[PDB]
Write a protein that binds this ligand. Structure first.
Ligand SMILES: *[C@@H]1O[C@H](CO)[C@@H](O[C@@H]2O[C@H](CO)[C@@H](O)[C@H](O)[C@H]2NC(C)=O)[C@H](O)[C@H]1NC(C)=O
Ligand SMILES: *[C@@H]1O[C@H](CO)[C@@H](O[C@@H]2O[C@H](CO)[C@@H](O)[C@H](O)[C@H]2NC(C)=O)[C@H](O)[C@H]1NC(C)=O
Ligand SMILES: *[C@@H]1O[C@H](CO)[C@@H](O[C@@H]2O[C@H](CO)[C@@H](O)[C@H](O)[C@H]2NC(C)=O)[C@H](O)[C@H]1NC(C)=O
Ligand SMILES: *[C@@H]1O[C@H](CO)[C@@H](O[C@@H]2O[C@H](CO)[C@@H](O)[C@H](O)[C@H]2NC(C)=O)[C@H](O)[C@H]1NC(C)=O
Ligand SMILES: *[C@@H]1O[C@H](CO)[C@@H](O[C@@H]2O[C@H](CO)[C@@H](O)[C@H](O)[C@H]2NC(C)=O)[C@H](O)[C@H]1NC(C)=O
Ligand SMILES: *[C@@H]1O[C@H](CO)[C@@H](O[C@@H]2O[C@H](CO)[C@@H](O)[C@H](O)[C@H]2NC(C)=O)[C@H](O)[C@H]1NC(C)=O
Ligand SMILES: *[C@@H]1O[C@H](CO)[C@@H](O[C@@H]2O[C@H](CO)[C@@H](O)[C@H](O)[C@H]2NC(C)=O)[C@H](O)[C@H]1NC(C)=O
Ligand SMILES: *[C@@H]1O[C@H](CO)[C@@H](O)[C@H](O)[C@H]1NC(C)=O
Ligand SMILES: *[C@@H]1O[C@H](CO)[C@@H](O)[C@H](O)[C@H]1NC(C)=O
Ligand SMILES: *[C@@H]1O[C@H](CO)[C@@H](O)[C@H](O)[C@H]1NC(C)=O
Ligand SMILES: *[C@@H]1O[C@H](CO)[C@@H](O)[C@H](O)[C@H]1NC(C)=O
Ligand SMILES: *[C@@H]1O[C@H](CO)[C@@H](O)[C@H](O)[C@H]1NC(C)=O
Ligand SMILES: *[C@@H]1O[C@H](CO)[C@@H](O)[C@H](O)[C@H]1NC(C)=O
Lengths: 88, 420, 50, 198
């Protein structure tokens, strides 16, 4: 690898959305005869949009989705005495 | 001397006088801000007691003063990758522009990637990369995302913005002609869409001139990238000071541990060795704290970058001065060493004229107010026009709505309202 | 002058009257042999992480 | 594994306190890590000498702990400010900011509490099924050029309609959906058609 040398994992010519990052665009994963593979991470499925100067696509239906966002707001209310800690 | 805050100006204010622009001007600004910094790593034992088991027998009575530094450095290193990923990996699929560039006259060849070069990077970002410039347990880990993946992300983002507008951020990309998208963007700032169709060639020429002048502004003066250069300068200076701290006695008889071990008897070598260890421990603690604070500020910068990319590239923004001076139209992201560069395209009003206004108009004892726009008068006749562009029209019953009578409004005038 | 490393042969410079060579830290980079007159070069062993 | 963000705050505090406690078992250079053991064996002239090292070590440990706590508290304050902003805008109103209150067009949100945190359930609107169409910037009728008011011109292949941009719903082109502006020899791409007068 560009970061170092990796022993115990077999190189694979494919490309998947990777699980365990390693460095320099190389990841490792556990897959099928089970073994650990090391490939080049795939950053998305290739796509091309049919663009022309007189063509538009307008949706004809919708769907309602409920997402979730979880974020912390406060931490533990700790307090430490100094004299009792050092010279109790 | 004494600084001057600006050029003095007094506006000609009166209770019936307005200034309405008669023209516009497209301008392209540039915003540069860092995203991530270098991922460093330090080994405490190798730094303090270099390959000396006698020193490593000491420094073990101090407890866990060596694992906490590694834990903090690892936390910073894994935070940098999250920063970069959340800044750039905003798109789900990788779009690409069609081989035929029929964009209504606009010319994006300077920002689109160049297949000829071995690296799929555009001209502007090549200029940006050209404009920006150990063995004591210190290592530098490589970033997870190589520059090619960043270039692919910003190319997919540009191809999506150009070929689908803002629809590629909500659901799936929907193709649309570029002229119609630009008309929608003018419609989003209170300017009637017909202005674009009537002045498309002029707007395209102004945009091309601005995107050409960006290259001259960048490739000639190198003082623009200072906000990205100082991050590297600060890290290189902190590391250099950390290295330079190994040549200090701290009260011992020598600053190198091998002479001390090869010159003094075991029972009294610890007297010098503990002082050396204490000095190096303090130097490491100070370096770690400074790195933690710097990473804390870099995280806020990266969060601002992500917010600005989301609200400014993936859709039009109504927040004032968030995306450049003037009314915002669209933006183009560009990659840079340890940062990102935005090219904000804004709409700036131009040459204006004095007129005479009136809050309402009396026709038959009724008071007509404009549905959208402002009543103006060139001196003899009264017209109704939009607030951001001079376009006079006859006052009819389709431009105004009736509400109340004439004996309440202050400043109402007299005229006739044509009935179609 | 104690220490570990690999003694590669390097033509660092003339060193007409000098013996030691130093770096940013107090690290002897190149040394002159005491028996013969040649300019040896000190390179530390391999480091890394697991 | 959904609540890792709130779990890491607890784990980090627990481990910080655990390390602070573990630091009590270090000699720091003296003969023993117990004040009573030293106090029951030595005279005060050397007891003070053996106690200064313990005092220094424990003071340094406390200083390090306090500094790390301060930095973590600042980060938590930033997160709390972001949460307060999201509660002010996504819940108490409707947000036009892209990707602020979820992917897609925002409709409404509901807050839910969590241990040392908060949870939002963003409800969003997402278009589903698309169709190709042929479009035109304007329509010339009698030399005049009619532009749509708040819609887009589409054509299924033989006829022309005006529809809203976010949901296919075709309508007949009249003088109520379009407004006239100038003549039809300037716009690029205009299409001949007839505009019905009601
Ligand atoms: C729009 O999409 C919705 C679902 O996204 C469609 O509703 C479904 O219609 C099928 C008909 O084959 C039913 O079997 C499902 O039970 C319906 N789902 C729900 C949740 O009601 C709807 O028919 C689509 N509308 C159009 C005009 O195609
Ligand atoms: C609005 O301003 C633009 C430029 O600021 C004007 O376009 C210029 O017109 C003159 C004609 O005297 C040409 O010589 C220039 O080459 C034009 N510049 C560009 C960039 O095209 C435009 O005419 C102004 N609008 C009006 C109504 O006068
Ligand atoms: C977009 O701009 C580029 C560069 O300004 C244009 O490419 C230039 O084209 C001229 C021909 O008129 C050549 O003489 C230059 O050598 C080209 N420069 C480069 C860097 O290739 C390009 O033609 C413009 N796009 C369109 C559609 O005209
Ligand atoms: C104010 O605007 C009115 C409306 O256009 C002007 O009246 C026209 O003036 C032009 C000459 O510039 C004549 O050719 C038109 O026949 C006039 N229209 C009508 C209905 O009479 C008027 O001249 C403008 N006032 C000034 C001072 O420019
Ligand atoms: C606008 O027109 C109205 C009516 O055309 C004017 O109202 C006049 O007010 C005076 C003052 O009391 C009366 O003596 C007149 O009889 C009113 N006119 C009529 C026709 O009854 C009003 O003064 C006009 N205002 C301006 C600024 O021109
Ligand atoms: C495009 O839309 C028009 C308007 O609805 C279609 O014209 C109608 O087609 C139906 C076919 O079932 C006929 O029954 C109607 O009488 C037609 N109306 C008129 C006013 O002619 C047209 O068929 C559509 N074209 C396509 C290819 O779907
Ligand atoms: C729309 O209709 C007009 C006529 O109403 C077309 O204009 C004609 O264009 C041809 C081709 O140059 C000329 O020979 C005729 O003299 C024009 N007619 C008139 C009345 O000027 C126009 O070409 C049509 N547009 C499209 C896109 O078909
Ligand atoms: C991957 O493909 C290359 C040729 O493109 C080949 O040389 C290489 O051996 C392949 N890797 C493996 C693991 O077979
Ligand atoms: C409008 O009036 C002000 C003051 O009366 C003057 O300074 C300004 O130049 C005028 N604008 C034009 C375009 O004449
Ligand atoms: C506007 O101000 C002038 C003073 O210059 C005053 O004479 C006039 O009555 C005012 N008119 C209105 C409608 O405020
Ligand atoms: C001492 O070293 C020099 C170096 O070349 C050599 O010429 C000489 O013979 C040596 N003398 C002895 C006694 O080893
Ligand atoms: C629209 O046309 C393009 C190419 O002309 C095609 O790839 C796409 O699938 C079409 N869309 C639909 C909904 O059929
Ligand atoms: C669209 O592009 C085609 C070229 O394939 C051209 O023939 C046509 O006139 C263009 N139409 C518009 C409205 O630009």
């Amino acid at each position: 690898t560009r970061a170092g040398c990796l022993i115990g994992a077999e190189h694979v010519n494919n490309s998947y959305e990777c699980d365990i990052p390693i460095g320099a665009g190389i990841c490792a994963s556990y897959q099928t005869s089970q073994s650990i593979i090391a490939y080049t991470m795939s950053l998305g499925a290739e796509n091309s949009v049919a663009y022309s100067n007189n063509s538009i696509a307008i949706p004809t239906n919708f769907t309602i989705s409920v997402t979730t966002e979880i974020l912390p707001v406060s931490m533990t209310k700790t307090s430490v005495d100094c004299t009792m800690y050092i010279c109790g | 001397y004494t600084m001057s805050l600006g050029a003095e100006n007094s506006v000609a204010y009166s209770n019936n006088s307005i200034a309405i622009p008669t023209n516009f001007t497209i301008s392209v600004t540039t915003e540069i801000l860092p995203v991530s910094m270098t991922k460093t790593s330090v080994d405490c034992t190798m730094y303090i007691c270099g390959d000396s088991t006698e020193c490593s027998n000491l420094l073990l009575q101090y407890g866990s003063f060596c694992t906490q530094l590694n834990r903090a450095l690892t936390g910073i290193a894994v935070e940098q990758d999250k920063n970069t990923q959340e800044v750039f990996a905003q798109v789900k699929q990788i779009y690409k522009t069609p081989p035929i560039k029929d964009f209504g006259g606009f010319n994006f060849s300077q920002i689109l990637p160049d297949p000829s070069k071995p690296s799929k990077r555009s001209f502007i970002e090549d200029l940006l990369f050209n404009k920006v410039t150990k063995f004591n347990g210190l290592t530098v880990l490589p970033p997870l995302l190589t520059d090619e993946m960043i270039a692919q992300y910003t190319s997919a983002l540009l191809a999506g913005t150009i070929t689908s507008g803002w629809t590629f951020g909500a659901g799936a990309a929907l193709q649309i002609p570029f002229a119609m998208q630009m008309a929608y963007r003018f419609n989003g700032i209170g300017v009637t869409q017909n202005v674009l169709y009537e002045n498309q060639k002029l707007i395209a020429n102004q945009f091309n001139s601005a995107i050409g002048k960006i290259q001259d502004s960048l490739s000639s003066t190198a003082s623009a990238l200072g906000k990205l250069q100082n991050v590297v300068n600060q890290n290189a200076q902190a590391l250099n000071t950390l290295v330079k701290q190994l040549s200090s006695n701290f009260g011992a008889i020598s600053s190198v541990l091998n002479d001390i071990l090869s010159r003094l008897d075991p029972p009294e070598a610890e007297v010098q060795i503990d002082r050396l260890i204490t000095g190096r421990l303090q130097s490491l603690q100070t370096y770690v704290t400074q790195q933690l604070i710097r990473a804390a500020e870099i995280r806020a910068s990266a969060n601002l970058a992500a917010t600005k990319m989301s609200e400014c590239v993936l859709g039009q923004s109504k927040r004032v001065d968030f995306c450049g001076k003037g009314y915002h139209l669209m933006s183009f992201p560009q990659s840079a060493p340890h940062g990102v560069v935005f090219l904000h395209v804004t709409y700036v009003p131009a040459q204006e004229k004095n007129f005479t206004t009136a809050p309402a108009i009396c026709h038959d004892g009724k008071a007509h107010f404009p549905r959208e726009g402002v009543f103006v008068s060139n001196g003899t006749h009264w017209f109704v026009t939009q607030r951001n562009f001079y376009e006079p029209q006859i006052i009819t019953t389709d431009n105004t709505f009736v509400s109340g009578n004439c004996d309440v409004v202050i400043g109402i005038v007299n005229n006739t309202v044509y009935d179609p | 002058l104690t220490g570990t490393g690999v003694l590669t042969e390097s033509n660092k410079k003339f060193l007409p009257f000098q013996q030691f060579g130093r770096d940013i830290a107090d690290t002897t980079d190149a040394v002159r042999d005491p028996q013969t007159l040649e300019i040896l070069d000190i390179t530390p062993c391999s480091f890394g992480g697991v």
